[model samples]
Target: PKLLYCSNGGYFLRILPDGTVDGTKDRSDQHIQLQLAAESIGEVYIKSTETGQFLAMDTDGLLYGSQTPNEECLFLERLEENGYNTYISKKHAEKHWFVGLKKNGRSKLGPRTHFGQKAILFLPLPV
Candidate 1:
Protein backbone atom coordinates (compact mmCIF):
# COMPACT_ATOMS: atom_id res chain seq x y z
CA PRO A 1 0.00 0.00 0.00
CA LYS A 2 1.13 3.51 -0.73
CA LEU A 3 2.03 5.52 2.39
CA LEU A 4 0.52 8.92 3.02
CA TYR A 5 2.26 12.03 4.25
CA CYS A 6 0.47 13.34 7.33
CA SER A 7 2.07 16.78 6.95
CA ASN A 8 4.99 16.19 9.30
CA GLY A 9 2.95 16.06 12.51
CA GLY A 10 5.38 16.62 15.35
CA TYR A 11 5.96 14.48 18.50
CA PHE A 12 8.21 14.70 21.62
CA LEU A 13 10.47 12.57 23.82
CA ARG A 14 12.26 12.87 27.17
CA ILE A 15 15.99 12.23 27.01
CA LEU A 16 17.74 11.66 30.34
CA PRO A 17 21.39 12.01 31.30
CA ASP A 18 21.86 8.24 31.21
CA GLY A 19 20.48 8.18 27.68
CA THR A 20 17.07 7.04 28.88
CA VAL A 21 14.51 8.26 26.39
CA ASP A 22 11.19 8.32 28.25
CA GLY A 23 8.16 8.90 26.13
CA THR A 24 4.51 7.94 25.63
CA LYS A 25 2.42 5.86 23.30
CA ASP A 26 -0.58 6.58 21.10
CA ARG A 27 -2.70 6.76 24.23
CA SER A 28 -0.58 8.87 26.55
CA ASP A 29 -2.85 10.91 28.76
CA GLN A 30 -0.94 14.20 28.50
CA HIS A 31 1.28 13.68 25.49
CA ILE A 32 2.22 11.51 22.55
CA GLN A 33 5.84 10.32 22.59
CA LEU A 34 8.69 9.53 20.23
CA GLN A 35 8.07 5.86 20.75
CA LEU A 36 4.50 6.44 19.70
CA ALA A 37 5.68 8.17 16.56
CA ALA A 38 7.97 5.25 15.95
CA GLU A 39 4.95 3.00 15.80
CA SER A 40 3.47 5.36 13.24
CA ILE A 41 6.52 5.62 11.01
CA GLY A 42 5.41 2.82 8.73
CA GLU A 43 6.79 4.52 5.64
CA VAL A 44 9.34 7.14 6.73
CA TYR A 45 11.99 4.74 8.13
CA ILE A 46 12.02 0.98 8.24
CA LYS A 47 10.89 -0.75 11.42
CA SER A 48 14.51 -1.45 12.34
CA THR A 49 15.23 2.28 12.15
CA GLU A 50 15.06 2.70 15.89
CA THR A 51 17.26 4.98 18.04
CA GLY A 52 16.49 7.98 15.87
CA GLN A 53 15.51 11.38 17.32
CA PHE A 54 11.91 12.57 17.32
CA LEU A 55 9.31 14.59 19.29
CA ALA A 56 6.17 14.12 21.40
CA MET A 57 2.39 14.12 20.90
CA ASP A 58 -0.81 14.90 22.87
CA THR A 59 -4.41 13.69 23.07
CA ASP A 60 -5.33 15.93 20.18
CA GLY A 61 -2.13 14.87 18.43
CA LEU A 62 -0.15 18.09 18.91
CA LEU A 63 3.26 19.06 20.24
CA TYR A 64 3.56 18.27 23.97
CA GLY A 65 4.67 21.78 24.91
CA SER A 66 8.20 21.98 26.39
CA GLN A 67 10.13 19.24 28.21
CA THR A 68 7.96 19.62 31.30
CA PRO A 69 5.07 17.47 32.43
CA ASN A 70 1.42 18.62 32.69
CA GLU A 71 2.41 21.83 30.98
CA GLU A 72 0.60 22.13 27.63
CA CYS A 73 0.65 20.61 24.16
CA LEU A 74 1.10 22.94 21.19
CA PHE A 75 0.71 20.88 18.02
CA LEU A 76 -0.80 23.43 15.67
CA GLU A 77 -0.02 26.39 17.90
CA ARG A 78 1.66 28.05 14.96
CA LEU A 79 5.30 28.93 14.40
CA GLU A 80 7.81 31.06 12.51
CA GLU A 81 10.71 30.42 10.12
CA ASN A 82 13.03 30.00 13.10
CA GLY A 83 10.84 27.23 14.71
CA TYR A 84 9.76 29.22 17.78
CA ASN A 85 6.32 30.50 18.55
CA THR A 86 6.19 33.85 16.78
CA TYR A 87 4.81 35.97 19.62
CA ILE A 88 4.81 33.53 22.55
CA SER A 89 7.83 31.24 22.21
CA LYS A 90 11.06 32.31 23.82
CA LYS A 91 13.76 31.40 21.30
CA HIS A 92 12.86 31.42 17.66
CA ALA A 93 13.14 27.97 16.02
CA GLU A 94 13.18 26.25 19.38
CA LYS A 95 12.47 22.52 19.15
CA HIS A 96 10.40 21.34 22.11
CA TRP A 97 9.57 17.76 23.26
CA PHE A 98 8.10 15.81 26.14
CA VAL A 99 11.44 15.20 27.87
CA GLY A 100 9.93 13.62 30.98
CA LEU A 101 11.54 14.31 34.34
CA LYS A 102 13.88 16.97 33.05
CA LYS A 103 16.57 17.88 35.56
CA ASN A 104 15.16 21.36 35.83
CA GLY A 105 11.62 20.15 36.58
CA ARG A 106 10.02 19.75 40.03
CA SER A 107 9.85 15.97 40.17
CA LYS A 108 11.14 13.52 42.74
CA LEU A 109 13.38 12.05 40.09
CA GLY A 110 16.24 14.21 38.96
CA PRO A 111 17.15 14.61 35.27
CA ARG A 112 19.27 11.48 35.06
CA THR A 113 17.31 8.24 35.12
CA HIS A 114 18.77 5.21 33.39
CA PHE A 115 15.43 3.41 33.42
CA GLY A 116 11.76 4.08 34.10
CA GLN A 117 10.68 5.46 37.48
CA LYS A 118 9.75 1.92 38.61
CA ALA A 119 8.71 -1.21 36.76
CA ILE A 120 8.75 0.77 33.55
CA LEU A 121 5.73 2.76 34.62
CA PHE A 122 5.69 4.44 31.23
CA LEU A 123 7.25 4.33 27.79
CA PRO A 124 9.83 6.96 28.74
CA LEU A 125 12.32 5.85 26.12
CA PRO A 126 14.49 3.00 24.75
CA VAL A 127 11.41 1.03 23.90
Candidate 2:
Protein backbone atom coordinates (compact mmCIF):
# COMPACT_ATOMS: atom_id res chain seq x y z
CA PRO A 1 0.00 0.00 0.00
CA LYS A 2 1.12 3.51 -0.74
CA LEU A 3 -0.01 6.93 0.36
CA LEU A 4 -0.92 9.35 -2.41
CA TYR A 5 -0.22 12.94 -1.49
CA CYS A 6 -1.91 15.65 -3.45
CA SER A 7 0.57 18.03 -5.00
CA ASN A 8 -1.63 21.11 -4.78
CA GLY A 9 -1.24 20.80 -1.06
CA GLY A 10 -0.12 18.20 1.50
CA TYR A 11 -3.51 16.54 1.60
CA PHE A 12 -3.44 12.79 1.45
CA LEU A 13 -5.92 10.74 -0.57
CA ARG A 14 -8.27 8.91 1.72
CA ILE A 15 -11.19 6.64 1.00
CA LEU A 16 -13.41 6.50 4.04
CA PRO A 17 -15.33 3.51 5.27
CA ASP A 18 -18.46 5.01 3.76
CA GLY A 19 -16.75 5.13 0.37
CA THR A 20 -16.10 8.84 0.34
CA VAL A 21 -13.02 9.98 -1.55
CA ASP A 22 -11.33 13.10 -0.28
CA GLY A 23 -8.04 14.63 0.75
CA THR A 24 -7.20 14.79 4.39
CA LYS A 25 -4.25 15.45 6.65
CA ASP A 26 -4.58 12.24 8.57
CA ARG A 27 -2.99 9.18 6.97
CA SER A 28 -5.60 6.85 8.40
CA ASP A 29 -5.91 3.47 6.71
CA GLN A 30 -6.79 4.76 3.27
CA HIS A 31 -3.44 3.97 1.71
CA ILE A 32 -4.27 2.86 -1.80
CA GLN A 33 -3.44 -0.60 -3.11
CA LEU A 34 -3.12 -0.41 -6.86
CA GLN A 35 -3.34 -3.56 -8.97
CA LEU A 36 -2.29 -3.68 -12.59
CA ALA A 37 -4.89 -5.00 -14.95
CA ALA A 38 -4.27 -7.45 -17.84
CA GLU A 39 -0.53 -6.62 -17.95
CA SER A 40 -1.48 -3.25 -19.33
CA ILE A 41 0.90 -0.45 -18.55
CA GLY A 42 -0.52 2.19 -16.23
CA GLU A 43 -3.90 0.47 -16.15
CA VAL A 44 -4.95 -0.23 -12.58
CA TYR A 45 -7.72 -0.50 -10.07
CA ILE A 46 -7.24 1.51 -6.88
CA LYS A 47 -8.49 -0.36 -3.87
CA SER A 48 -9.18 1.00 -0.42
CA THR A 49 -7.98 -1.30 2.31
CA GLU A 50 -10.19 0.41 4.86
CA THR A 51 -13.40 -0.05 2.90
CA GLY A 52 -12.54 -3.13 0.92
CA GLN A 53 -13.93 -1.45 -2.18
CA PHE A 54 -12.44 -0.53 -5.49
CA LEU A 55 -12.40 3.11 -6.49
CA ALA A 56 -14.84 3.70 -9.29
CA MET A 57 -16.17 6.48 -11.43
CA ASP A 58 -19.64 7.14 -12.71
CA THR A 59 -21.01 8.56 -15.96
CA ASP A 60 -21.46 11.89 -14.20
CA GLY A 61 -17.78 11.85 -13.23
CA LEU A 62 -18.42 11.35 -9.56
CA LEU A 63 -15.88 9.09 -7.80
CA TYR A 64 -17.11 6.19 -5.78
CA GLY A 65 -16.39 2.63 -4.76
CA SER A 66 -17.86 -0.71 -5.69
CA GLN A 67 -17.57 -4.28 -4.50
CA THR A 68 -17.54 -5.20 -8.14
CA PRO A 69 -14.71 -3.96 -10.31
CA ASN A 70 -15.28 -2.98 -13.93
CA GLU A 71 -14.03 -0.64 -16.61
CA GLU A 72 -15.29 2.39 -14.72
CA CYS A 73 -13.05 1.30 -11.86
CA LEU A 74 -9.97 1.43 -14.03
CA PHE A 75 -7.55 4.33 -14.28
CA LEU A 76 -4.33 5.01 -16.13
CA GLU A 77 -1.44 6.47 -14.22
CA ARG A 78 0.82 8.75 -16.24
CA LEU A 79 4.11 9.69 -14.65
CA GLU A 80 4.90 13.35 -14.88
CA GLU A 81 8.26 15.08 -15.17
CA ASN A 82 8.17 16.15 -11.54
CA GLY A 83 8.05 12.53 -10.35
CA TYR A 84 4.33 12.66 -9.77
CA ASN A 85 1.52 10.76 -11.46
CA THR A 86 -1.57 11.99 -13.26
CA TYR A 87 -4.50 9.68 -12.92
CA ILE A 88 -6.88 9.63 -15.84
CA SER A 89 -10.03 7.62 -16.03
CA LYS A 90 -10.19 4.64 -18.37
CA LYS A 91 -13.77 5.34 -19.33
CA HIS A 92 -14.83 6.46 -22.77
CA ALA A 93 -14.51 10.17 -22.22
CA GLU A 94 -11.16 11.91 -22.42
CA LYS A 95 -12.13 14.74 -20.11
CA HIS A 96 -12.36 13.09 -16.74
CA TRP A 97 -9.46 14.36 -14.68
CA PHE A 98 -8.90 13.26 -11.09
CA VAL A 99 -8.62 16.17 -8.76
CA GLY A 100 -8.12 16.95 -5.12
CA LEU A 101 -9.55 19.31 -2.52
CA LYS A 102 -10.68 22.69 -3.66
CA LYS A 103 -10.26 25.86 -1.62
CA ASN A 104 -12.95 24.67 0.74
CA GLY A 105 -11.69 21.08 0.86
CA ARG A 106 -14.00 19.59 -1.72
CA SER A 107 -12.91 16.93 -4.17
CA LYS A 108 -13.81 17.34 -7.84
CA LEU A 109 -12.96 16.09 -11.31
CA GLY A 110 -12.17 18.66 -13.91
CA PRO A 111 -11.38 18.26 -17.61
CA ARG A 112 -7.68 18.52 -18.08
CA THR A 113 -5.52 17.92 -21.19
CA HIS A 114 -2.18 18.23 -19.48
CA PHE A 115 -0.34 16.82 -16.51
CA GLY A 116 1.00 18.61 -13.41
CA GLN A 117 -2.16 20.68 -13.05
CA LYS A 118 -2.61 22.14 -9.59
CA ALA A 119 -5.05 19.45 -8.55
CA ILE A 120 -3.80 16.51 -10.59
CA LEU A 121 -0.32 15.83 -9.35
CA PHE A 122 0.03 12.91 -6.96
CA LEU A 123 3.18 11.88 -5.13
CA PRO A 124 3.39 8.36 -3.84
CA LEU A 125 4.50 7.73 -0.25
CA PRO A 126 6.47 4.63 0.57
CA VAL A 127 4.84 1.89 2.63
Candidate 3:
Protein backbone atom coordinates (compact mmCIF):
# COMPACT_ATOMS: atom_id res chain seq x y z
CA PRO A 1 0.00 0.00 0.00
CA LYS A 2 1.08 3.61 -0.53
CA LEU A 3 0.36 4.56 3.08
CA LEU A 4 -0.50 8.02 1.78
CA TYR A 5 -1.26 10.54 4.45
CA CYS A 6 -4.96 11.35 4.21
CA SER A 7 -4.47 15.12 4.35
CA ASN A 8 -0.98 15.38 2.87
CA GLY A 9 -0.63 15.20 -0.87
CA GLY A 10 3.02 14.15 -1.09
CA TYR A 11 3.92 12.68 2.25
CA PHE A 12 3.93 8.93 2.90
CA LEU A 13 4.14 6.80 6.02
CA ARG A 14 7.37 5.40 7.44
CA ILE A 15 8.14 3.10 10.40
CA LEU A 16 11.46 2.85 12.18
CA PRO A 17 13.11 -0.01 14.07
CA ASP A 18 12.48 1.68 17.40
CA GLY A 19 8.70 1.68 16.67
CA THR A 20 8.57 5.32 15.65
CA VAL A 21 6.02 6.17 12.95
CA ASP A 22 5.82 9.37 10.94
CA GLY A 23 4.95 10.83 7.57
CA THR A 24 7.60 11.65 4.99
CA LYS A 25 7.53 12.76 1.39
CA ASP A 26 10.84 11.13 0.62
CA ARG A 27 10.36 8.40 -2.02
CA SER A 28 12.85 6.01 -0.61
CA ASP A 29 12.12 2.53 0.75
CA GLN A 30 10.16 4.03 3.62
CA HIS A 31 6.85 3.10 2.05
CA ILE A 32 4.69 0.27 3.42
CA GLN A 33 3.90 -3.20 2.14
CA LEU A 34 0.81 -5.09 3.27
CA GLN A 35 1.13 -8.82 3.78
CA LEU A 36 -1.77 -11.16 4.38
CA ALA A 37 -1.58 -12.90 7.70
CA ALA A 38 -1.78 -16.63 7.21
CA GLU A 39 -3.52 -16.99 10.51
CA SER A 40 -6.59 -15.05 9.48
CA ILE A 41 -8.52 -14.22 6.34
CA GLY A 42 -9.03 -10.47 6.61
CA GLU A 43 -6.09 -9.72 8.89
CA VAL A 44 -2.79 -8.31 7.57
CA TYR A 45 0.56 -7.11 8.72
CA ILE A 46 2.10 -3.83 7.64
CA LYS A 47 5.79 -4.19 6.96
CA SER A 48 8.28 -1.46 6.27
CA THR A 49 9.74 -1.55 2.77
CA GLU A 50 13.01 0.00 3.94
CA THR A 51 13.33 -1.92 7.18
CA GLY A 52 11.96 -5.34 8.12
CA GLN A 53 10.08 -4.08 11.17
CA PHE A 54 6.41 -4.87 11.39
CA LEU A 55 3.90 -2.11 12.18
CA ALA A 56 2.53 -2.69 15.64
CA MET A 57 0.71 -0.81 18.36
CA ASP A 58 2.16 -0.63 21.84
CA THR A 59 0.24 -1.10 25.09
CA ASP A 60 -0.05 2.66 25.42
CA GLY A 61 -1.99 2.92 22.15
CA LEU A 62 1.09 4.15 20.29
CA LEU A 63 2.44 2.92 16.97
CA TYR A 64 5.67 0.99 16.89
CA GLY A 65 7.78 -1.26 14.69
CA SER A 66 7.93 -4.87 15.70
CA GLN A 67 10.77 -7.08 14.57
CA THR A 68 8.55 -10.08 13.99
CA PRO A 69 4.97 -10.92 13.39
CA ASN A 70 2.85 -11.41 16.49
CA GLU A 71 -0.71 -11.05 17.74
CA GLU A 72 -0.19 -7.37 18.48
CA CYS A 73 1.18 -6.83 14.99
CA LEU A 74 -1.90 -8.11 13.26
CA PHE A 75 -4.53 -5.66 12.05
CA LEU A 76 -8.06 -6.37 11.02
CA GLU A 77 -8.44 -4.77 7.62
CA ARG A 78 -11.71 -3.26 6.50
CA LEU A 79 -12.70 -1.25 3.43
CA GLU A 80 -13.96 2.20 4.20
CA GLU A 81 -16.72 4.09 2.42
CA ASN A 82 -14.07 6.42 0.94
CA GLY A 83 -12.49 3.47 -0.87
CA TYR A 84 -9.61 3.41 1.56
CA ASN A 85 -8.66 0.70 4.01
CA THR A 86 -8.99 1.21 7.75
CA TYR A 87 -6.93 -0.95 10.05
CA ILE A 88 -8.25 -1.87 13.45
CA SER A 89 -6.02 -3.54 15.95
CA LYS A 90 -7.09 -7.09 16.61
CA LYS A 91 -5.59 -7.03 20.07
CA HIS A 92 -7.47 -3.91 21.01
CA ALA A 93 -10.83 -4.81 19.58
CA GLU A 94 -12.68 -3.06 22.34
CA LYS A 95 -11.75 0.37 21.02
CA HIS A 96 -12.25 -0.41 17.29
CA TRP A 97 -9.66 2.20 16.31
CA PHE A 98 -7.76 2.72 13.11
CA VAL A 99 -4.19 3.62 12.42
CA GLY A 100 -4.29 7.36 12.28
CA LEU A 101 -1.94 10.33 12.20
CA LYS A 102 -1.79 13.03 14.80
CA LYS A 103 -1.89 16.78 14.18
CA ASN A 104 1.84 16.89 14.75
CA GLY A 105 2.27 14.46 11.80
CA ARG A 106 3.12 11.52 14.00
CA SER A 107 1.40 8.17 14.19
CA LYS A 108 -1.69 8.24 16.32
CA LEU A 109 -3.58 4.97 16.69
CA GLY A 110 -6.85 6.19 17.98
CA PRO A 111 -10.60 5.79 17.59
CA ARG A 112 -12.10 5.15 14.19
CA THR A 113 -14.53 8.01 14.68
CA HIS A 114 -11.83 10.69 14.91
CA PHE A 115 -12.62 13.89 13.03
CA GLY A 116 -9.39 14.84 11.24
CA GLN A 117 -9.27 13.91 7.55
CA LYS A 118 -5.87 12.26 7.78
CA ALA A 119 -6.59 10.53 11.03
CA ILE A 120 -7.96 7.32 9.50
CA LEU A 121 -7.48 7.32 5.77
CA PHE A 122 -4.82 5.44 3.77
CA LEU A 123 -4.79 4.99 0.01
CA PRO A 124 -3.03 2.16 -1.71
CA LEU A 125 -0.19 2.91 -4.13
CA PRO A 126 -0.15 1.74 -7.72
CA VAL A 127 2.20 -1.09 -8.56
| Cα lDDT listed for each candidate | 0.25, 0.65, 0.65
lDDT for residue 115 in candidate 1, whole number 0-100? 28
Give the Å error, residue 5, model 3.
4.3
Which RMSD does model 2 reach against the true structure?
A: 2.8
What local lDDT does model 3 show for residue 70?
A: 81
Estimate the TM-score for candidate 1: 0.18
Winner by lDDT between candidate 3 and candidate 1: 3
Question: Against the true structure, what is each candidate's TM-score?
Answer: 0.18, 0.80, 0.78
Write the residue-wise lDDT of candidate 3 on 1-127 in tens digits: 4445444343556776576777665556444443334357888777875677887787666777888878778887877787876677778867766677655567775543353455667766642
Candidate 3: misplaced stretches above 4 Å? Answer: 1-10, 29-39, 111-118
lDDT of 2 by residue, 27-108 (tens): 6544444333432777767777556677777776666766778877878777878888767877834765564454343566
Higher lDDT: candidate 1 or 2? 2
TM-score of 3: 0.78
lDDT of 1 by residue, 6-62 (tens): 111222233332333343223332222233221222211111123332332343323
Ranking of candidates on lDDT, top first:
3, 2, 1
Clashes of each: 15, 0, 2
- Could you tell me the lDDT of residue 73 within candidate 2? 80
Colliding pairs, model 2: none
